[PDB]
């Protein structure tokens, strides 16, 4: 019934808060000014990047930025993995199915959650203490110029739905429990869990945004946009793996990308 679904929402929200250092709540405070904290160091060009090394943590520039984005994704994957293990029934699944779900879902969540840190002008980094501008990321030499821009385009549309952390906690869980990922061994228990999460998400969107009608339906349409940006992103990384040599992909990300789209 309704009560059980609310309890699911709340367990997931608590778990999200534990797993993810920087929430959409703080990110937005930081971005609108409303936090009393020291503003993030703005990185709008090659020099500001240089001066801002003291505020962030590890050859040419495009490559260095990409490898920084790389370090952070590994930590995202780790955080997302801990979050998944808190989704009731996830750890009882066939371990190979847990791996498949993460493998295909982690990037979809990375983009979803990256939108929390983004506006039309740029993205917060190093847990809110840098802000790297969109123009600066575009201005990178190709193929690194094209890397973040589809994430900004998506974020701009996604952020219009005005979801909060409590909504997002359930949405991310729904994404993880996708019964149609390639190579799953036992679909039914995954779909049983996702059916519950989807009900929990719908109730949540009615309660938390009663003025917003069909936010639930708008949100499901975006799960498909996410797969695109993930596919588009795998291909650009395919290009980068080939056309560049002075840079190794992190092992965890190798595990994730090989035999993926």
């Amino acid at each position: 019934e309704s009560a059980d679904l609310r309890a699911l929402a709340k367990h997931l929200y608590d778990s999200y808060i534990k797993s993810f250092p920087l929430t959409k709540a703080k990110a937005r405070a930081i971005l609108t000014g409303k936090t009393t904290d020291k503003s993030p160091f703005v990185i709008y060009d090659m020099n500001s990047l240089m001066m801002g090394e003291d505020k962030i943590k590890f050859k040419e520039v495009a490559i260095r930025i990409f490898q920084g984005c790389q370090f952070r994704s590994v930590e995202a994957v780790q955080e997302i993995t801990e979050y998944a293990k808190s989704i009731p029934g996830f750890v009882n699944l066939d371990l190979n199915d847990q791996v498949t779900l993460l493998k295909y879902g982690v990037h979809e969540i990375i983009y979803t959650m990256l939108a929390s840190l983004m506006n039309k002008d740029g993205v917060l980094i190093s847990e809110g203490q840098g802000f790297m501008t969109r123009e600066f990321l575009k201005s990178l030499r190709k193929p690194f110029g094209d890397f973040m821009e589809p994430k900004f385009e998506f974020a701009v549309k996604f952020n219009a739905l005005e979801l909060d952390d409590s909504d997002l906690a359930i949405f991310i869980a729904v994404i993880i429990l996708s019964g149609d990922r390639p190579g799953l061994l036992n679909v039914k228990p995954i779909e049983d869990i996702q059916d519950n999460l989807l009900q929990a998400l719908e109730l949540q969107l009615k309660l938390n945004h009663p003025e917003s009608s069909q936010l639930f339906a708008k949100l499901l349409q975006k799960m498909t946009d996410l797969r695109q940006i993930v596919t588009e992103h795998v291909q650009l990384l395919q290009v980068i793996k080939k056309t560049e040599t002075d840079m190794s992909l992190h092992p965890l990300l190798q595990e994730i990308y090989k035999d993926l789209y």
């Binding site: 993995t81 371990l95 791996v99 092992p251 595990e255 994730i256």
Partner: peptide
């Protein structure tokens, strides 16, 4: 295969 992913899960 997926040794790290496996490791992160089994933790």
């Amino acid at each position: 295969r997926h040794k790290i992913l496996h490791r992160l899960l089994q933790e």
